[PDB]
Amino acid sequence: STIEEQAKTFLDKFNHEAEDLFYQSSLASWNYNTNITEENVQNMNNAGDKWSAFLKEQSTLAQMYPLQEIQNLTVKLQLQALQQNGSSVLSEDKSKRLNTILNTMSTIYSTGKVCNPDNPQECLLLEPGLNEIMANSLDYNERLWAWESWRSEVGKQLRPLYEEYVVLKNEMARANHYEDYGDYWRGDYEVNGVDGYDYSRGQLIEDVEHTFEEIKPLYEHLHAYVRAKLMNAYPSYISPIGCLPAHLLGDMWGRFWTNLYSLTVPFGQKPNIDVTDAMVDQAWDAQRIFKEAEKFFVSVGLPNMTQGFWENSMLTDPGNVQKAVCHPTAWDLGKGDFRILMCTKVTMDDFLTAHHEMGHIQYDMAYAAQPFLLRNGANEGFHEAVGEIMSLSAATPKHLKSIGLLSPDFQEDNETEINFLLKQALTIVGTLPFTYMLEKWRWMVFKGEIPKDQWMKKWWEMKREIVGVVEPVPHDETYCDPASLFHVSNDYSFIRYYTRTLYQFQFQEALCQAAKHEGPLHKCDISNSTEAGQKLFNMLRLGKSEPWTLALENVVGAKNMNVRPLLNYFEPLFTWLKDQNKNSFVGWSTDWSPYAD
Amino acid sequence: TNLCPFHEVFNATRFASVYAWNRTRISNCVADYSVLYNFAPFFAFKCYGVSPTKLNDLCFTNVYADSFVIKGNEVSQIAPGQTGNIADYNYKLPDDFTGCVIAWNSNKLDSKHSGNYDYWYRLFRKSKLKPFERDISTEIYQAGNKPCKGKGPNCYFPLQSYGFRPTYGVGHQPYRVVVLSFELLHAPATVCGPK
């Protein structure tokens, strides 16, 4: 007989064998996250150990099916995944030490704290204390201390472990014929065996470099405006041509600039949009929010929520001795069981988060028919992009006005649109350079082209070169600032956010052109449009069965990523910023420093 | 008047797993279909080649009743000209058929926490089954060109379990199906409708 039939029956058995043990483990994780107890932890650990043992015995068995003989890509993709040896190639001692290091770093991150040097009895924590400080505080020395103490106390402990972590990761990567761990991470975009759609891991860097060049113009004007604002907000501290202090970015790391809206609002006298008061007056609840959200997806022709969705999901904080992890997440347990966990409360941000989670659930339900190994998004950022386009479409004044929240007496004007675009830009445009620089530094470090005696130096160099931010206090090799971030310490990627930010605008433009929208793009609304819904569903059903390039070509008619939609979207703000910056300086000096004078 | 034992097969606890679907012969009794609403009014009533109205004034010699449990998604495979694992290896109807199919939901009855592994089904076989055929073989299936010497590579057990739970989606919940076949032969009729 042939090997193809053997592999097919093997995969058919594996799917059914793995579905059940998953259902058990998935149910266990849900029961644990819903009620923290000692027995649930042990049960979840047992289920995870059983699942890992099952994956171990299922692997090392498909090696009898060489890939060079298979011809149907449907089975070839399923087989290529199981053949991955993973960390099993390393020795027992090395794997044990790596797991111990990971757990120790996670514990250090989750248990860090700070205390006042002049008052050791006074101590604070990151989540309740430092976030609120960096958000609402306005003093200079206070923010400087909050920025310096946490780092000096936490990062200096993770420095030695990170080197061994990098060494072990590079060894594991080279064991599996990869050039390094960065090449392994970039494997999610690799595509072969299809003429006209091939994609290499190296071409991604070229594409990112080519795309980043077009964003510098708008970022320069935004930085100029923010600097002009800060010079009036904090005189005698901000330089007219120097870089902005890191501790003044509203957060500990400088990822989002949303906190600067109150200081950068051009027309502070105009009425800002906040329907929280109307929602409180009408006495809405979580069920109302979720039903209004479901109606949005029903208006475009998508399926309704399942019956068990409302019975099993948790949409309210118990507010009792029971403790739960309040963090919006979408759970897919299989067998048609979909649930959401969220400590929902009356607020517009919660409305947008509910829309995002329902968008995620729709995607999860779309590809439920594909084989187990293929029930996943074709790309990392597609889920987040699909979730964010819905929030964008819903956040329009027209949508809120159609549901009776905003009174018809409200009149639109240039200032309102300018403020809306500025608020959107402060959130979206601010994270791209930071993400790019962080990912590039991480790749260059994993590549081994930066000896240990230059890590922190090149960090600040690339910072001042790209983002144009200068540190308020000089640091040496004893400090480890990159390790003071969640994703960096928890071994997570970053490029997914960049890809999602690039794809969401293309998706929005395509869906709005499908609905025959007119006028500016930021006023588009896809409600009551079935053509766009069908066009999107035609792609949501593919899943992991086809390359992302073909799906993107079917959706927007293009293969590679493009930035023109974002520029067309932000054209009004880009044009308005020039009238203000005409009398301001452009660029930033890389020599000035707060402690240089 | 003498009624049929319909109330038995519709009220039993066990329901004749598909891989060993049971068959019962009904003869010499009056068929009263109004009792079906006692068990479940909500039904998936559907017939082929005959209507439930003209069925009340006809006569037949013997009536065969088949029963088994399957998922909700596989209910579409129980019909002429269909394909699939169930239709090809467990139970196959002929291209020409005259009867009715009945289905109702039995989640809270058969479903149980920790999984109900008492039901089994077949998924591997060398050839397809003929119309109205039954097979209870338990020998291991050979996928490769090597002789069988116990479970192992290319040797798989031809039976598997469902494992129903009460927290399953409607597509995976258990469904009890009953098939009624009407037969006519050169002998005195024994089954007819009321007056």
UniProtKB/Swiss-Prot annotation, chain A:
Post-translational modification here is noted as: N-glycosylation on Asn-72 may limit SARS infectivity. Proteolytic cleavage by ADAM17 generates a secreted form. Also cleaved by serine proteases: TMPRSS2, TMPRSS11D and HPN/TMPRSS1.
Q: What induces it?
A: Up-regulated in failing heart. Expression is induced by IFNA and IFNG. Exposure to cigarette smoke increases expression in lungs. Expression is decreased in nasal and bronchial epithelium of individuals with allergy after allergen challenge. IL13 stimulation decreases expression in nasal and bronchial epithelium. (Microbial infection) In airway epithelial cells, expression is increased upon influenza A virus infection.
Protein name per UniProt: Angiotensin-converting enzyme 2
Q: How is it used in the lab or industry?
A: An engeneered stable, dimeric and secreted receptor with combined mutations that increase the affinity for human coronavirus SARS-CoV-2 spike protein shows potent SARS-CoV and SARS-CoV-2 neutralization in vitro.
- Look up the record and give one Gene Ontology term from the biological process aspect: regulation of cardiac conduction
Outcome (variant: Q24L)? Increases slightly the interaction with RBD domain of SARS-CoV-2 spike protein
Q: Which GO terms describe its cellular component?
A: apical plasma membrane; brush border membrane; cell surface; cilium; endocytic vesicle membrane; endoplasmic reticulum lumen; extracellular exosome; extracellular region
The EC number of this protein is 3.4.17.23, 3.4.17.-
Please give the range of the full-length protein represented by this chain.
Answer: 19 to 615 of 805
User: Which species does this protein come from?
Assistant: Homo sapiens
Outcome after substituting R375K: Increases very slightly the interaction with RBD domain of SARS-CoV-2 spike protein
Subunit composition?
Answer: Homodimer. Interacts with the catalytically active form of TMPRSS2. Interacts with SLC6A19; this interaction is essential for expression and function of SLC6A19 in intestine. Interacts with ITGA5:ITGB1. Interacts (via PDZ-binding motif) with NHERF1 (via PDZ domains); the interaction may enhance ACE2 membrane residence.
Q: Per UniProt, what does mutating R201D do?
A: No effect on interaction with SARS-CoV spike glycoprotein
What changing F22D does, per the record, is: Increases slightly the interaction with RBD domain of SARS-CoV-2 spike protein
Molecular function GO labels: carboxypeptidase activity; endopeptidase activity; identical protein binding; metallocarboxypeptidase activity; metallopeptidase activity; peptidyl-dipeptidase activity; transporter activator activity; virus receptor activity
UniProtKB/Swiss-Prot annotation, chain B:
| UniProt-annotated stretches for the region Receptor-binding motif | 105-175
**Covered residues of the complete protein?**
333 to 528 of 1273
Q: Where is this region: Integrin-binding motif?
A: 71-73
Phenotypic consequence of L36I: In strain: Omicron/XBB.1.5, Omicron/EG.5.1
Effect noted on mutating Y121F: Decreased HLA binding to NF9 epitope. Increased binding affinity to human ACE2
What is the protein's species of origin? Answer: Severe acute respiratory syndrome coronavirus 2 (2019-nCoV)
The record's region (Immunodominant HLA epitope recognized by the CD8+) falls at 116-124
Name of the protein described by the UniProt record: Spike protein S1
The UniProt gene name for this protein comes to: S
Q: From which domain of life does this come?
A: Viruses
